[PDB]
Design a protein around this ligand. Structure first.
Ligand SMILES: Nc1nc2c(ncn2[C@@H]2O[C@H](COP(=O)(O)OP(=O)(O)O)[C@@H](O)[C@H]2O)c(=O)[nH]1
Ligand SMILES: Nc1nc2c(ncn2[C@@H]2O[C@H](COP(=O)(O)OP(=O)(O)O)[C@@H](O)[C@H]2O)c(=O)[nH]1
Lengths: 429, 99, 429
């Protein structure tokens, strides 16, 4: 049991998912047809969490793909592992978002949100024991900010107990891929703090550095950028799909990592990340994988963790290894960096150990670290919002879609409530 | 000045005629999206009738009460529903119950 | 025993039947010559219900084909499986209906109804134990509304005990294929409520949506529309022609589905209905076939069942399956949709399970659901009648055929008696 329904939204969240389902099919051994060509019977035992068995030994992904124009869905069905999806799940409109939250959430979302929830409710009944949903979108564009946050509110009113986690892409601070991205981010963080459980903030700028510096890549396309996000998304639920010595899941991370009902924005991190030639000048041990998860050059949210304190740390390991060798390192990085952790939470490291490695490697990891260092991320969104709102510019595109100036006030005031909270628990006593 | 006239969308609801099991979609009705009232009938055409209602389309917009035929867009007010019919005959059912 | 005499009428009912006898011959394995080329001996055991054995191992359909002009009968004998009918049964006049109920029922029907009943009475004596008749016509045209309802009254005066069911095609509400179709429908429903036992209301508009949306067809001709009606007509009597675990027939559905001697207008429904490419992304189980029979997008009478309550539900399944798996689903859709069923009839679902599937599939179904949702169908006929009668327009074509204005009064008043009854049993206590 414990099945998961995957929801995609926007141009960004589709292309993340279109690489993500390639990664999951590489573990469980699924051809682009949809049949099975594996070697181990452990791949087929927990297969139901991301699959429904069709008639004739074929498996389909439990995915829901949402857009407002068919310019992206045609790319998904044409690419490899595009025939694997069911043709009913491609729900899409015709008007297009226009890179607008107000078009994505109020007007053109309302003509489509009823068509999506029929696909949601059909997939919810077919599962035996529903574990929880997951969503992949972006806070910059129109669809992933508007249509996504509309789907979160409609689900939470109908499922007030299931876990709901989003791999949201927060816009980078230096470059700006959208002129109105301080409006799309601020009007969507107001939705996320009240209707989710945990949220994995990913910045684009941190992903460019890892391919450039750490992996030593010359021409990083998005297929090499999204492959790091998809390897992170598989690493969160990798103990739910495989037997392990110490097991955790989406529920246990939602209890451990989240000590307060608002403070639930995380930052991910993956290890090991070698080069194409430097993968022989490195010994793959647990203390080697430990000292790569914690440095600043291997985060994914563009914020140095040294500016704030950690609160909770999850370290999901994969592959066979000594439990003593794990428990020694998780104590070791907690003693010497004693100022970098919060004091009134003792033993603030949650450990999970799977057994089966990723395809190709011997052992791996996945860093899920909550911190106060993401107060810097909401400084720059709250500053760039007020820099653009005090002149009331780029505003008539949102007023004409049924919105007032008071909605911008409560959304911004909700964000400065949040930065006051991370500031308070940095200097507790 | 630059803080202009605040081109504003009314938030009005449209119950279609006869359909008791219908909620009415709030449209961003402004003077910018419709230069004429006759253009407002065109947007009401596709987004009300799907399979079973209105063979004549959209002709007559009534009030929710309803005792008056809506003329131009100046006869609309912010935050009130309207019964959208397509004939002279009116159906008196409870539209606004349990929105 | 238990033989059935099939009667066709009008241009519509002939072309439905001309595809229907192709479907029955595909089950029992009959060539266009009339010989036998089957594989299983189960096809020849109950063959007598729709056939009479001729001399020389040839079988003929027990059909009676009626028209008022030979423009349609020439199309039947020229098409494939047109040589299979007997040349004596083609009873047809010369004047033509003129798309007129008053010509079809009074004047030109009287010169032909004596010639039809000699063919009826000849086929009634050749059967051993007569099960009952069935009729295929339409309430829109001239012949199927006038000549058909004249044949129903002449049969019921001579057979006051046999079952009499009609697959009448009720005209669609939005488009109008006939200007005077509110007159042909109203003057024929007055005949049907007093001389039949059960009636399967089929609308054209619902059949266009199923080929467009559900089957994903590009160019649906009537051969693809009538193939859904013929698959429904075979599915009603499919337990009478084959052995099954739990068996029902035309008599048992007439007792279960009909709790009052007037309220007997049904709506059909068929499942499964895949696409041409989407037939692999679907598992054929009993809970899959259950959740397709009950939604609004797979009815055949243009009325959403959610507007009213059900009264009785027949679910004739085909193919080998678990009886527990059927009885669990027929309880499951009755508990969660508890408001959508009538209260003072408990366990309002009749189940029948055959054994032999249709040709090509593994398991199938047939939904026969009575409801109060067909009060909407008789609102629009009764409204469009009074909209055209208060001006007394299109009336001189009916007065000149021997009719008064009082006949229109009692026919319309009989219909508003019927809508008052379905309104009353929607709010019982
Ligand atoms: N990481 C990543 N971000 C992407 C990708 N494609 C688009 N984006 C982000 O998506 C945003 C642009 O919005 P868009 O994808 O069109 O979404 P929508 O406008 O809401 O439909 C920017 O923040 C881009 O950085 C991709 O392949 N990878
Ligand atoms: N479903 C269906 N309806 C048909 C077909 N052919 C004609 N009709 C219907 O028949 C009606 C027209 O009347 P007609 O068939 O000529 O019958 P008549 O005038 O009484 O002989 C309309 O309601 C058509 O929709 C067909 O192949 N399929």
């Amino acid at each position: 049991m414990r099945e998961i329904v995957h929801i995609q939204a926007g141009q960004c969240g589709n292309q993340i998912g279109a690489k993500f389902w390639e990664v999951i099919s590489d573990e469980h051994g699924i051809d682009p047809t949809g049949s099975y060509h594996g070697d181990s019977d452990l791949q087929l035992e927990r297969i139901n969490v991301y699959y429904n068995e069709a008639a004739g030994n074929k498996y389909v992904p439990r995915a829901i793909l949402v857009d407002l124009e068919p310019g992206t869905m045609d790319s998904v069905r044409s690419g490899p592992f595009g025939q694997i999806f069911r043709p009913d799940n491609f729900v899409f409109g015709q008007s297009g978002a226009g890179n607008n939250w107000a078009k994505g959430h109020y007007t053109e979302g309302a003509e489509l949100v009823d068509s999506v929830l029929d696909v949601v409710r059909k997939e919810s009944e077919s599962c035996d024991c529903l574990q929880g949903f997951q969503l992949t979108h972006s806070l910059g564009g129109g669809t992933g900010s508007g249509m996504g946050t509309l789907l979160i509110s409609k689900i939470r009113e109908e499922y007030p107990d299931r876990i709901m986690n989003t791999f949201s892409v927060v816009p980078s601070p230096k470059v700006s891929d959208t002129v109105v991205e301080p409006y799309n981010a601020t009007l969507s963080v107001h939705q996320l703090v009240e209707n989710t459980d945990e949220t994995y903030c990913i910045d684009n700028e941190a992903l460019y550095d890892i391919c450039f510096r750490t992996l030593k890549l010359t021409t990083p396309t998005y297929g090499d950028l999204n492959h790091l996000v998809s390897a992170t998304m598989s690493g969160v639920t990798t103990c739910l799909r495989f037997p392990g010595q110490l097991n955790a899941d989406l529920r246990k991370l939602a209890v451990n990592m989240v000590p307060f009902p608002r403070l639930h924005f995380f930052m991910p991190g993956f290890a090991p990340l070698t080069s194409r030639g430097s993968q022989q000048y490195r010994a793959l041990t647990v203390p080697e994988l430990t000292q790569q998860m914690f440095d600043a050059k291997n985060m994914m949210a563009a914020c140095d963790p040294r500016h704030g304190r950690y609160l909770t740390v999850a370290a999901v390991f994969r592959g066979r290894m000594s439990m003593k060798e794990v428990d020694e390192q998780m104590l070791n990085v907690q003693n010497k960096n004693s100022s970098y952790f919060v004091e009134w939470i003792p033993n603030n490291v949650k450990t999970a150990v799977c057994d089966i490695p990723p395809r190709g490697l011997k052992m791996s990891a996945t860093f899920i670290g909550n911190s106060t260092a993401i107060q810097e991320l909401f400084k720059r969104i709250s500053e760039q919002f007020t820099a653009m709102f005090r002149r009331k510019a780029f505003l008539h595109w949102y007023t004409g879609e049924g919105m007032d100036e008071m909605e911008f006030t409560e959304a911004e005031s909700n964000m400065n409530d949040l930065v006051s909270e991370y500031q308070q628990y940095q200097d507790a006593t | 000045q630059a803080l202009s006239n605040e081109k504003k969308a009314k938030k009005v609801r449209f119950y279609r005629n006869g359909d008791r099991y219908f909620k009415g979609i709030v449209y961003a009705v402004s003077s910018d999206r419709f230069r004429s009232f006759d253009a407002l009938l065109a947007d009401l055409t596709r987004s009300l009738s799907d399979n079973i209602n209105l063979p004549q389309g959209v002709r007559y917009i009534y009030t929710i009460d309803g005792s008056r035929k809506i003329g131009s867009m100046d006869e609309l007010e912010e935050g009130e529903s309207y019964v959208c019919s397509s004939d002279n005959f009116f159906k008196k059912v409870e539209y606004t119950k349990n929105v």
